[PDB]
Design a protein around this nucleic acid. Structure first.
Lengths: 259, 135, 50, 178, 38
RNA sequence: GAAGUUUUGUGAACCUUAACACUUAGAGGAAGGAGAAGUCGUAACAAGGUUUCCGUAGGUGAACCUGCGGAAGGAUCAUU
RNA sequence: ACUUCUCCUGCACCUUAUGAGAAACCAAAGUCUUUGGGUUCUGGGGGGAGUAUGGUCGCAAGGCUGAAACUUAAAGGAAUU
RNA sequence: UACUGUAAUGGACUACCGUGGCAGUGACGGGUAACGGGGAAUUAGGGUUCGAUUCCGGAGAGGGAGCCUGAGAAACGGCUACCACAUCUAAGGAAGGCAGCAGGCGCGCAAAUUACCCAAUCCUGAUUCAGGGAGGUAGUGACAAGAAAUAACAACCUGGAGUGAUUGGAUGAUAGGAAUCCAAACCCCUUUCAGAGUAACAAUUGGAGGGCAAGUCUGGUGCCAGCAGCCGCGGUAAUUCCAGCUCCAAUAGCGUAUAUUAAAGUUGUUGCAGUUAAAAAGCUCGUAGUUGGAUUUCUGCUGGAAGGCCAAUUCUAGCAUCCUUCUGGACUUUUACUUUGAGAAAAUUAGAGUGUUUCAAGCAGGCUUGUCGCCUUGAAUACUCAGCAUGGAAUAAUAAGA
C-alpha cells in the first residue's frame, strides 16, 4: 500500500531466474528498459549463470570497477534489468554475451563474436509523431529512434548500430519471416510465420511453424521477428529453438550422463 | 422420487441444507446453542475450585456411592459435578483446591452407573494417576 | 441421585489389602532382541495355567 | 516459516488385532531380522506409492504419450533397484510385487546373502558398528536398499578389524596387558 | 411431534384420545392465566 | 506575512427519547423427567371380563366414562 | 330379452412366478448394486412435544407453522416356540 | 439536462425535471466461536471439514475524527482534538501509544532468551566504505517429521533348529583433545588417549469376560470399596475390583479429553427410505420451477495423404446436378456441448533426473595431474467454473412459418 514496494521476495520472484528456495529469504529486485518478469537482473547473471561472483557483495566489487557495459554504456547499478536482446560487454576476457531465451524458457547469456556484438535488434511497439511534426519509433527496449523510413510499421524489428545511434537494417512483419517467441507457453521457440488472425477488438494471434513441422500459436506481443524466410540476422542458442519432446528430452539427457 | 433433469440444481441443493437439520449430530455442531450450553467454552479442559465434596449413587442394577466433586469453573463460575477416578482419592481433593476437569469421553451425555459428564484429571496439578500409583 | 451418601468408607480396599514387594528377576531383552524371542518360541493357547 | 517439506514414511493399519495379519508380519520380522512393525509398514507404504502409480497408468492406453513416458521411467527404477528382473519389463509385473521382494533387497539381507555376517541378527550389528564398504564409502544403516550394480561391491570397510585396521579397543587391552 | 403414529399404542399407554384432551385443558388454562397478567 | 476574526464544510465527544439485540432477579402458578420402596383404584394386553382405536363434544378423585360419524390395526375374508 | 364369440373402459376376484420382499404378503410393493422415463410432498434412534415462545387464520373451540434445556439403550416391525 | 469537484469517469456534489430502481433464481434484515485466495487434512469414485499462520491481495496501529509535508500517507516507532486508560511535577505545567524484537503483569486448558552479528539473503543513502531486532546464528523445545542403541558369536541339557546368569574371548552412550565448522562460540562429519559383563549404561506405556490380541492361575474384599467408552462384573468360591506371577499389543514412545474426517448407501448427484418399522398433503384447480412425441442430404463408387501389423483405424478430395464478392473471409438462424489452442506467479501437490551414507529432504552434481577444464550441464513437464478463440455431420435448446 501507500507507495511502491522496495523489496521483492524469493519464491515470489520469477521461476525462470532459478533462484533456490533456501539460502536467502529475499531475492534481488530489478525499473529499466525492461519489465520485472520479462527481464533478469545483472546480479544473477554474474553469480547464478556466469559463476564469476560467489556473493552479493562480490557483484558490487565487480560492477564498481566499471568493467561491465551494456549497449556500449557502463551501468554501475547491480540490479539493472538486462532483458531480451541486450548485449553485455566485458573488456577483460574480451568476451560478449547477447541474452536470448533458451528453449526450456530461461534466460541464458549466449556467447558471440566481436563484430556481431556491435548490433542488436529492437521490435517496435508503435510509431508516433513528436513535436515540430517529426515522426518517431518506440521500441520494446524503450528507446525512441527518430526520422525512420516511412516503410517501417508496427510489430517489426530494426537492427540498431549502437556504436552510433542510428538504424541500419529494417525488417518487415509478414508470412515467411523468421520469428522467436519472447513470452507465454511457447517461449524460446523459433519458426516461420504461416498466418495471423485479426479478431477486430482485442488480441491478434499468430499460428506459426517450427523447422520440424510442428505448428503452434501465440499472441503478437510475445512474437518477435528475427529475420527473413529462413536465415536470420542473429546467432541462435543451442537447439535453435526447436523444443524437442518430453520423452526425447529424457532420452538425450540420460544418454549424456552415462558418459 | 428425485428430479433427475439437468437444470434441477436448486431443488437438489435446497433439500440438503433444509434436511441436514434432521440429523441429531448436525444440530449439536451447527446451532448457536453450543456456546451458551456446556459449562465448558467449546474446550477440552477447564480449571475450577471445589466448592463441595459430594457422593452420589449409581442407578440399579449397580449400587454404591460413587464419590464426585462439585466445582465452579474459573471463567464462568458455573457449578458442575466431576467424578473422581479410581479407588479413594477423595481425601486428596481438599475443599477449595483447584482441580482440572476433563470430559468423561462421551461428549457430555452420560457415562455408566447418574447425570455426570465430567472427570477430575488433576488435583493441585499433581494428577490422579501419580498419587494412586504413588510414583 | 441422593446427595447425602456418606464418604466414610472411601479408600477401603486400597488400605485393606496386604502389601507385597515385586521379586527381583533378570531383565528381558528389548526392541529387536525381544522380537527374536517371540518369533522362535511360537513356531518351535500361549498362557496355560495349571 | 522455514521452507522445508516433510512427509510420513508409514501409517498404521485400520484393524489393530487380527491373527491372520499379526502372524504373517511376524514371519517377515523373523526372516529378515527387523526391529519393530514400523519397518514393515514403511515398506508396505513404499510399495503402495509404486503400485498406485502403475494402477493409474495401466487403465489408459499403450499408445498414450503419458503412459509411454511415465511407465518407462517407473520400469527403469525397478530394473535399477533390482526389484523386478530385466527379462520382464511389462508394467503389469510391477503389480505382482510383494513386501518380501523389497526386504530381500535391503542391506541386512545382502550382507547375509553375501554371507560375511552369518545369521540375520549379526548382519544388522555389523552394519551399525561401522563396517561394510558399499562402493567407495562405508554405510551405517540397515534399511539402505541396493541398486544391483552396487551389490557385488559390498565389502568390509578398509578401516576396522575385519577390514585390516587397528583392532578396535578391547583386543589392545588384552595385547598390551599381556 | 408424532404425526401418523400419534396413537400407535404399541405398548401399555395412557390412550391418545384422552391424552390430547388432557393437554388441551392444560393449554386452555395457560391462556386465561397469561391474559390475566396483562 | 504573524496573532486575532467572518461564513461555510469535514466533524470527534457528550446528552434526551425510542427501538432492536443479549445476559438477568422475581412472590405465586404450572410442566417434564429422575428417585427406591409409599397411598388409592384397574385402564390397556385373552372377546383383559362394557372389543380396541380415531376425529369432535360434554362430564368425573384418578386412570377414565358417555354422545354422534368413522377404521379394522377385530373377536367375522363365508349362506335367499 | 337370452345364448355363443371379439373389442376397448370400469370396480374386483382366483391361480402362479428363475419377479420382489425382513417377513406378513404383493399384476404391483415387478421390470433397482445387472443401481438413472418425468415430477410434487414427506422422514433420519426413543422421549421432551405437536408442548414452550413468536407469527398468522378463527366469533370461539382451536387450525397451520414449530423449537430448546434436560433425558434415555433401546423404542419399533414380521413371523417362531 | 447544465454546473461544481476530482489526478480523471461518475448522484461524487449542487440546482431544476421525470417517477423510477431491486425482489420468490431469496431483495431488505439477522447470525458467524468469517479477513479472501494460493492451499491443508481426509487411503475407490463423488465428497465432507479446515485455511489467525511462509506467498499474493485487504484492513488496522487503544477508540473514533481531522490534517501538514511529499512522487506517493488521510501515516501513527508524524502532528492537532475529544473520549478511555496512565507517567513525572517544585502543583505553574510537561510529556505517552510493544497487533516491531526480547521481557513482565493479567486472562486463560494453552505458548521460548530482557542473548551474539550484519558474515549469508536483500533493502535504504550523498553510497565499492555507513546502517538494518528486516534477516541470520545460538539458547529453551517429546507441537511436529526422518533415521535407529538397549546386544552379537562361541565352545560346553530338549533332539527332532531352539534353550541354559556355565564360563569364554572378540562398537558409541559418555568425558577430554586435535583439526574442521563458525562473524565469534556451538552442533554435525573425520581421527584420537581413556570408555560394559547380572552389558546397574537395568524400557516404558496400556491391557489379559465379550467386542479386541492375552490367564476356567494364586491371595485380599464381600452389590462394600471400586471397575465399566457399550454389553456387563462385585450380595463369602470374582475368567472384569485391589495386588502378585505369567502372557499379550505397540515401542522411545504410549494412554486420556475435546473438535474433525473415514466407517455413514445413518443426508444418499453417483446412492437410501416412505402398505405394516421414522415418513404420501383429505381432495381437485394452478402460477412460476422442472420435464416434454414422431419428422427436414441419407446411401454408393473412384481417388489422395497417412497408418498400425504380420488390408484394419484415422483424416480428406471428387462424381450423382453443391454457394459465391475476391486473391486467406464473407454468407450457412443463434448458443450450449465437445475438440484443439491462447493467456494464466511461484511455494505446495503429482512428477523427470540425481547414492543428502539411507531417509524426510535438497536442487544439486558428475567426470579428470588439467591451468581460456570439459559434460556447446542440469534445475524437465503437468496442474491453475466464468472469460477470449477454433474444427465438428449427432444430441438439446432457439429463431422462422425471394
Amino acid at each position: 500500500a501507500r507507495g511502491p514496494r522496495k523489496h521483492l521476495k524469493r519464491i515470489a520472484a520469477p521461476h525462470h531466474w532459478m533462484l533456490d528456495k533456501l539460502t536467502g529469504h529475499y531475492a534481488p529486485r530489478p525499473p529499466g528498459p525492461h519489465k520485472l518478469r520479462e527481464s533478469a537482473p545483472l546480479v544473477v547473471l554474474l553469480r547464478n549463470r556466469l559463476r564469476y561472483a560467489l556473493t552479493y557483495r562480490e557483484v558490487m566489487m565487480i560492477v564498481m570497477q566499471r568493467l561491465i557495459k551494456v549497449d556500449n554504456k557502463v551501468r554501475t547499478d547491480q540490479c539493472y534489468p538486462a532483458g531480451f536482446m541486450d548485449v553485455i560487454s566485458i573488456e577483460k576476457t574480451k568476451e560478449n554475451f547477447r541474452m536470448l531465451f533458451d528453449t526450456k524458457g530461461r534466460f541464458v547469456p549466449h556467447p558471440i563474436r566481436e563484430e556481431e556484438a556491435s548490433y542488436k535488434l529492437c521490435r517496435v511497439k508503435k510509431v508516433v509523431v513528436g513535436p515540430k511534426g517529426v515522426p518517431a519509433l518506440i521500441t520494446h527496449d524503450g528507446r525512441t529512434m527518430r526520422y525512420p523510413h516511412p516503410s517501417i510499421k508496427a510489430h517489426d524489428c530494426i537492427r540498431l548500430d549502437l556504436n552510433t545511434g542510428k538504424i541500419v537494417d529494417t525488417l518487415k512483419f509478414e508470412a515467411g519471416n523468421m520469428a522467436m517467441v519472447t513470452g507465454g507457453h511457447n517461449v524460446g521457440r523459433v519458426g516461420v510465420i504461416v498466418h495471423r488472425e485479426r479478431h477486430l477488438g482485442g488480441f491478434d494471434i499468430i499460428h506459426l511453424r517450427d523447422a520440424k513441422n510442428n505448428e503452434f500459436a501465440t499472441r503478437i506481443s510475445n512474437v518477435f521477428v528475427i529475420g527473413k524466410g529462413e536465415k536470420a540476422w542473429i546467432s541462435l542458442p543451442k537447439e535453435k529453438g526447436i523444443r524437442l519432446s518430453i520423452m526425447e528430452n529424457r532420452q538425450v539427457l540420460l544418454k549424456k550422463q552415462q558418459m | 422420487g428425485k428430479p433427475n433433469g439437468i437444470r434441477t440444481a436448486r431443488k437438489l441443493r435446497s433439500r440438503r441444507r433444509v434436511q441436514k437439520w434432521a440429523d441429531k449430530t448436525y444440530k449439536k455442531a451447527h446451532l448457536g446453542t453450543r456456546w451458551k450450553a456446556n459449562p465448558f467454552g467449546g474446550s477440552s479442559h477447564a480449571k475450577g475450585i471445589v466448592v463441595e465434596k459430594l457422593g452420589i449413587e449409581a442407578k440399579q442394577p449397580n449400587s454404591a456411592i460413587r464419590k464426585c466433586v462439585r466445582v465452579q469453573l474459573i471463567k464462568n463460575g458455573k457449578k458442575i459435578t466431576a467424578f473422581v477416578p479410581r479407588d479413594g482419592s477423595l481425601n486428596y481433593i481438599d475443599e477449595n483446591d483447584e482441580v482440572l476437569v476433563a470430559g468423561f469421553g462421551r461428549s457430555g451425555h452420560a457415562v455408566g452407573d447418574p447425570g455426570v459428564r465430567f472427570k477430575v484429571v488433576k488435583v493441585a496439578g499433581a494428577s490422579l494417576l501419580a498419587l494412586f500409583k504413588e510414583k | 441421585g441422593k446427595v447425602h451418601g456418606s464418604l466414610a468408607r472411601a479408600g477401603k480396599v486400597k488400605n485393606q489389602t496386604p502389601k507385597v514387594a515385586k521379586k527381583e528377576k533378570k531383565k528381558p531383552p528389548t526392541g529387536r532382541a525381544k522380537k527374536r524371542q517371540q518369533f522362535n518360541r511360537r513356531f518351535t493357547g500361549p498362557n496355560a495355567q495349571t | 516459516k522455514s521452507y522445508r517439506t516433510y512427509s510420513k514414511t508409514a501409517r498404521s493399519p485400520k484393524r489393530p488385532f487380527e491373527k491372520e495379519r499379526l502372524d504373517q508380519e511376524m514371519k517377515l520380522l523373523g526372516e529378515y531380522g527387523l526391529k519393530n512393525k514400523r519397518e514393515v509398514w514403511r515398506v508396505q507404504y513404499a510399495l503402495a506409492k509404486i503400485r498406485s502409480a502403475a494402477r493409474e497408468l495401466l487403465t489408459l492406453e499403450e499408445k498414450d504419450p503419458r503412459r509411454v513416458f511415465q511407465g518407462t521411467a517407473l520400469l527403469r527404477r525397478m530394473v535399477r533397484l533390482g526389484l523386478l528382473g530385466e527379462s520382464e519389463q511389462k508394467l503389469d509385473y510391477v503389480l505382482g510385487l510383494t513386501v518380501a521382494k523389497f526386504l530381500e533387497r535391503r542391506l541386512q539381507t545382502k550382507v547375509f546373502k553375501l554371507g560375511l555376517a552369518k545369521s540375520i541378527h549379526h548382519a544388522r550389528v555389523l552394519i551399525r558398528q561401522r563396517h561394510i564398504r558399499v562402493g567407495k564409502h562405508i554405510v551405517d544403516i540397515p534399511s539402505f536398499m541396493v541398486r544391483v550394480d552396487s551389490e557385488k561391491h559390498v565389502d568390509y570397510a578398509i578401516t576396522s578389524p575385519f577390514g585390516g585396521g587397528r583392532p578396535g579397543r578391547v583386543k589392545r587391552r588384552s595385547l598390551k596387558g599381556g | 411431534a408424532h404425526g401418523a403414529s400419534r396413537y400407535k399404542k404399541a405398548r401399555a399407554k395412557m390412550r391418545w384420545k384422552w391424552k390430547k384432551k388432557r393437554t388441551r385443558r392444560l393449554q386452555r388454562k395457560r391462556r386465561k392465566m397469561r391474559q390475566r397478567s396483562r
